[PDB]
Amino acid sequence: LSQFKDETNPLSSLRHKRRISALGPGGLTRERAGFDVRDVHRTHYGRICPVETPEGANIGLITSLAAYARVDELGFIRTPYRRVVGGVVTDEVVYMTATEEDRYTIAQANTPLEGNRIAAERVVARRKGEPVIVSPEEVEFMDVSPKQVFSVNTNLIPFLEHDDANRALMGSNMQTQAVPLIRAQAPVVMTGLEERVVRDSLAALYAEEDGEVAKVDGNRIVVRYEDGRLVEYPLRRFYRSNQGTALDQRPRVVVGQRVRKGDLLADGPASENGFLALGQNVLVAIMPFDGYNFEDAIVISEELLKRDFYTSIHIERYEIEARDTKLGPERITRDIPHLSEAALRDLDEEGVVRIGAEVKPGDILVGRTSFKGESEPTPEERLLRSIFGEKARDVKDTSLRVPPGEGGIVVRTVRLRRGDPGVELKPGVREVVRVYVAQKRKLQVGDKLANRHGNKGVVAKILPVEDMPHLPDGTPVDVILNPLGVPSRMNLGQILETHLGLAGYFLGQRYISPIFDGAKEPEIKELLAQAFEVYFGKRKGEGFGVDKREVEVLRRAEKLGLVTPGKTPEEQLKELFLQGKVVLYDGRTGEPIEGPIVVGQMFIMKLYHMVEDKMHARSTGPYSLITQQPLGGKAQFGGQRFGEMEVWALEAYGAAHTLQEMLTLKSDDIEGRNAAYEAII
Amino acid sequence: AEPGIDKLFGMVDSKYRLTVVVAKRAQQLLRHGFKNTVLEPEERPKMQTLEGLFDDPNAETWAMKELLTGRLVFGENLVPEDRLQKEMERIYPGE
Amino acid sequence: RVDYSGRSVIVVGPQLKLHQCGLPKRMALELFKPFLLKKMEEKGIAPNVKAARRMLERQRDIKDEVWDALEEVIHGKVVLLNRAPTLHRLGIQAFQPVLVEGQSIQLHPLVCEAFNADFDGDQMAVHVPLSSFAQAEARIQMLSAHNLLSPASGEPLAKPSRDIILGLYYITQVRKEKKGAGLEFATPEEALAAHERGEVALNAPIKVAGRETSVGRLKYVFANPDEALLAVAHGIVDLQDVVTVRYMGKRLETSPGRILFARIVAEAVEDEKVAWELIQLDVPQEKNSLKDLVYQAFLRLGMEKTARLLDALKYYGFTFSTTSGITIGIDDAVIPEEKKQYLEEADRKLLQIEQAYEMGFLTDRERYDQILQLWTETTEKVTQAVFKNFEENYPFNPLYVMAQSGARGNPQQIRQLCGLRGLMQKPSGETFEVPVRSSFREGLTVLEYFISSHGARKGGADTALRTADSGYLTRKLVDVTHEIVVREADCGTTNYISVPLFQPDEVTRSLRLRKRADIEAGLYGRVLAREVEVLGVRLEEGRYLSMDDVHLLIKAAEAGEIQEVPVRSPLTCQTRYGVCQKCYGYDLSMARPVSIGEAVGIVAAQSIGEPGTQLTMRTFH
Amino acid sequence: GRLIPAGTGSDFVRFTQVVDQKTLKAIEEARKEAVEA
Amino acid sequence: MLDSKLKAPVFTVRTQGREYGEFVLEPLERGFGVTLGNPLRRILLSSIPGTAVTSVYIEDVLHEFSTIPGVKEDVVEIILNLKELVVRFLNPSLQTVTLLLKAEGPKEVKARDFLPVADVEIMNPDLHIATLEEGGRLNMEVRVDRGVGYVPAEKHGIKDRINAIPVDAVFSPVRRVAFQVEDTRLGQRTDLDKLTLRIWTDGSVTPLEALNQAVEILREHLTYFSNPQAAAVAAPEE
């Protein structure tokens, strides 16, 4: 029940603290009570999120506490309902348990109000779980807000009501895995929560009283409060989360700035002005692209890379122990025995790598020498040495090296010694050394991107801007999402997000569109109309008519019955823009794409990359002492697991030798694997 | 696909015999340099690198080319088991 | 655990030919290290192996020539790719690697279906066949391009998939224009006259003095294919317009589209003649028709030449979808005008139900039952309307197009986007008598949304109750069948089974022709046990039943001329712990007789097991 | 640890031999040393 | 390196007869396959000068959708057979020629049977036009014209003889063009383009010739960015 705090980003932690397990000292996985327990109960309404849950074999066992829900002293989850008396609705709110609730006829929140008065003839209500239509006389309580039904994470999904649940689960989960970018943006279309989350997550640093800013540098902020108090705020800087992602507060405030109580001072890792910023807003055209977006895969304009758009900073920690031995002590030292000097360059510092060095895989982080092999040199090596001015030293190179698959650049080394400072070291250890290595991970093929509507994919292609589909005004797009990822998923929320986002892109505005409340088709279409004026309205003023290609497209467009026949070229184009579709030019050919394409701004997150899911390759390495099977080293990968399932596939192929060599030469058979190597060499 | 897979299949009575024949011909086609080859100069497999088409090193291939020319013979119980591992060392040095 | 192996995230490789895959060089360099080290010694880039190995320990010390030495080591050689869980034989396939920059394995799109891989971050493991022998197996029997048909059903498996269909469908479609109705006149130019002053449509279903026509057909009359296509390129006609073309001496009425498709096949199979008689020219290409095109190609031309066609279809399919201009805007989830009514008529029929209950003619359950009965009928009548609407009015609509082409989506899903979600079921199993009236376009109510999440779980849970492991079944099956291999060529047994072509008990004990699939599944690739003379043609004993042979029998049974077929089966085979080649029959994955030595029990276990994972589990209705 | 009894491991297939036309002068080695003097 | 600049790419050609050629140009820097490929393709299909039949007189048929007695084919089919006739002007001055042909009875008719006129020579002399048998006869005034691309019959006006039926005129002698750009390597560079370009001609022009003069039309068009003419920039008006 105690676990490694998930702090990939602020929300990860918030969500982690709000979790609810059925496992531990209560009945778990063995018993699995399938389809029971794992199951959203009528009473979960407003107490537990019906969507936020782990996909996979923990489904419905671990679970998330709903936004407004509260746990009382007896340990029961309660939910706020406002008391309604005779069709008028009081602001007097009550926190009912599950059993108290069952005594009542509770109306839904969208129920039309005319002031405090219930305006509607018939009212939707739940009577102990039962959806019913009732007249307003019969109503005893009302929901506070759609917000209450869902977890925090889910509440962050705009247009949620348009997404099937299975995919909104994936949405509210992936947000957890969103890595903090260095140019993070809060979404164009928000729900509400995004500000208040950062507040509670303790991500960003706020001012506790009215005052004026005294000092500000990347390192600390000092504030003179109206009483005279000068309080200093150390700005936690470039620090390492459990997950290796960085957290660092940056100052968002200038010297001599007047500041109200509760005003912002520093942004967290994943906030943009105190609004949760978990990703970028980015232009997306939804259309297939030559197969590069084939099966959830995503294409990417190199332009993103240049704008440092999906760039995150990651810090890895390395440790090395200097241990006492039965053979005698070993030491951290610059003086290792070998055939190199250019292999010591950025070390000098008495064993340890210099703070600021670029370290590649295989390079020396910390130099270390152990007394080795029960201290016998080979009679065969004894000679070899005396031919070269023998030393035949007792101590071995056990130096710490940057493992394959990369390191980066050194930022802090930390040294702890022989108990004496205030340190309890593992028994047998003389001292440890830590080296911390930072890397600006740019976006690249393989990286996985996600929107909040559970559309998730892997960057399969990076095209040069010239190849990118562009609007007529010469603006190219950033990502190309495939439409086939929508019909079967029934996550229509992203399409709406895009439409509003398109209007936003031209009107230079962002939106708050509450869950089960928010923007609605006609309101978006009105904004798209305004936007059209910017996107097109000016073209005539700057001296341009409609493109011959624009005409070509409309001809085809009216046969699809998107546009009205007879209406002018321009007014057809508006009609099309109201459906959130534009005319797109193919940057390869210059010709247009037959029929209009939906483009617009979408919020997308780059997702945390786990070491287990990093790229792996073994040739030949260590082996297990007892079983003599390939085993993973420090800077040497273990082998892949070959299971009976894979053994059947091979059998069904009749690939007899392959199966054999898989389970002998390439594993178990001892001399087999040596003779094999020697042979190949 | 491989150049001639359909017809390679047509040459045998069991899918698996092909593979066997091929492997074994590759084993000997390696064991004796590439001296055994029943492939006339101009029809030898080729590569491209360092810019100069040297012979294709892949013997798994070689065997498949030779089969398709039909200059080879395969059978269940042809020649005795050791009147072969020495008789092949006569025409082409084992070195 | 295993010695020459690696794992990585996969990314699609649209550029790859079917037998290739993209391997990051960094990963290739480790997997082939020992081999690499030797080439290094054979080239003036290392004295000996120790010094070569030392060259490779640190990334900065790695030279250029080294990567050229890799492309040479790799030559010919193939690797294996595996995506877990390996549910059947195709869970492992062999490709020859192509070294790529970056750190992702690049996977050909046609092999995704079998791997059941998709690109939301699946990883594949890579393995390296070391020996001369293991390489031959890998290359001859595991190479992707040699496994185009399924060993379970013998239907193609590497077949056009998604965007690929979409592309190809869009070009082989033809527009249906309505602003010309069904007028007639003194045709010649008086027809086109109308068209000129905007009166008739061009693909309008005119039926002039004599015959039915476009406009259209009499306007655009091309002497050869490339004249037609020079035209479309000149923007004076679309691939979808119906037109007149003289092809192969025949004077045709199709779209330039359909010609272009016909060409694609012809060129890919190096055979203009056979091409034209594999193709279904008078329908839009879709999941199924293409499937059948591949299968035929496979039987008629090689498997080698089939893979060429496969990549050809891939290539165009892909490029044609890009310019096609299919997307999804909110306005594409088209709600049929009919929905108002069906719901208003439902709602009033519901009054009547509630009345007859409040009187006391209805038992609690009788009412409840009757309500569900109703909402069911209605959900149907709506789904019906949605599609009818799309077909009449917006037949090129992206949602419609995707669903029909088989590219993606089913009617249940389309109904949920445009019609209504319909009835959801309670956690307890029973159904809510109030259905979800909203479509995902309209956007559900918070109550509608909660209500409907109950089934959401049951879903997720019952998937992840087999998507962890239902290879539970396949285990059980291997354990009983693993010893069975095609051992003899013929066990020489006389007896057999008799596959029926009729189902009893319809009108209790009445006979009824079995379904075509159900028969194909019983008959294809079986050896005939006794002669069967049917429809004036004698099918001989010992004959392997080809697919056409089966349709013949079906044809003969429809003509009431046969009722069962005597068929040599493994049920009656007399091979000791094994099965003879005659009693097994066709390979299935290759459409020929099984080769002696096939591990046919394992193939049976996987075939039965693999689908098990997608068998909606506990009894729910 | 044994070669499986199926595919390239089945007995029906396992023991196949391959020889070139020129190495088929091994059967002439029997044909040139059978009768002595 | 970065690198320095770039190699001047090799240009290869294989040429099967006078009717087809493949053109490979490698290596090109990232993107340049498409940058070259497309312009040249549209030039090749729209703007290379050629000839073809534009309208036809026939002695004994009024409508274009009629059939004629004693000649086993449609009127339309004969028109179709003409749309495939390829001729070449060996004189630069010639703009329009009306070719003569006349024959009847139990004989087959090739292209060659056209009466030899001016500096005009038929490329495909064995082109099948029509078969005839008994009584039925054929006399016509087949009118050729120098042009570009594809001009339909309804798209060009001012009609000829009192019996003139316009013909869709495939002027362009390039029957088809197709190109694919594929990745290629040079040292550490995996990012470079290699441009393969396949061209079919009717054989009045070499495939390689068509290309030669395709590039030209682009080359010459680039010299139009030459004589800069000033103009006022538009007011912002906001």
Add this chain to the structure above:
Amino acid sequence: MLDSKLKAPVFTVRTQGREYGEFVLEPLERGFGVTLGNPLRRILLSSIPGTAVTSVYIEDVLHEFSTIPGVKEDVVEIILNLKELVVRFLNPSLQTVTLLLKAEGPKEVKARDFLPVADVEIMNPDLHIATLEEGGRLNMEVRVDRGVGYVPAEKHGIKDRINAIPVDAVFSPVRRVAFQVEDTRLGQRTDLDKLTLRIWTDGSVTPLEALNQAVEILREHLTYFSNPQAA
């Protein structure tokens, strides 16, 4: 009299800044608007050589992830800012320069604060670089190189000073490129093309200059088609 072709088109420019340009070419043969506009826009967006910041050395920093005292910005933020710096090499034989900038005390450092170098103009002297509070001192050398396209820092070993920080280079001075193709006539000839390029740049290079170079590149590419080879 040979009406087969048509008179050489009028090429008319409409150019004011160093930053924006419109370029017109009418009448062209039908289609030719694209045949020309596209390849040019590709060559423009991709292949025009520019200048850009390549490495930054700062007085008392060791690496990119440090933070200067008395300075609001992180070192990462400052580089991001330095990426926005646009500079002209008035001399075309100049491949690279190092700009110096020492600053001190309460002030807001912008790009004009850089020590001036002969034959090198800073196109955006107002661009914000850092804010310095009391006693905060910023002292830096900024390397500017001439180049083409996109060249990321991991792709250069810029080892002039061992404490320099290599920066990603975005050389292209062309910032955005649209083209219009509109209906135009010449007497009885109806569907002719009127091509109109629109080129935005950073100021270090001009729209017209960029356009000329882009043409010259394409011109020099159609060169490679003559001088064949057998297969």
